[PDB]
C-alpha cells in the first residue's frame, strides 16, 4: 500500500485554488499541489496575497 501512496504523492493544466475563509484581511486557500513559501498570489479582483503560513 506504500507504493500507491508514493505514486499518489509523485504524480503531481494550471493549478487553481478556492477561497474558504475571509474577514479582517486573512484568507485560507487550498488545492495548490505546487506550493511556495512567500509567493505572490494573484486574486481575481486584482489584489495580491502573500503566503505567511503552510
Amino acid at each position: 500500500i506504500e507504493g500507491a501512496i508514493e505514486d499518489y504523492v509523485s504524480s503531481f493544466r494550471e493549478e487553481i485554488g478556492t477561497v474558504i475563509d475571509a474577514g479582517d484581511g486573512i484568507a485560507h486557500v487550498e488545492g495548490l499541489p505546487s506550493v511556495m513559501t512567500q509567493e505572490l498570489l494573484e486574486f481575481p479582483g486584482g489584489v495580491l496575497g502573500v503566503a505567511l503560513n503552510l
Binding site: 499518489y8 503531481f12 487550498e30
Partner: peptide, 19 residues
C-alpha cells in the same frame, strides 16, 4: 487523503483503478 476538498477527481479515480 480521500477527504481532501478539491474540485478535480482524476487522481482519485486513478488511485481507485490502481487499488
Amino acid at each position: 487523503h480521500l477527504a481532501e476538498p478539491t474540485d478535480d477527481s482524476a487522481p482519485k479515480v486513478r488511485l481507485l483503478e490502481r487499488l
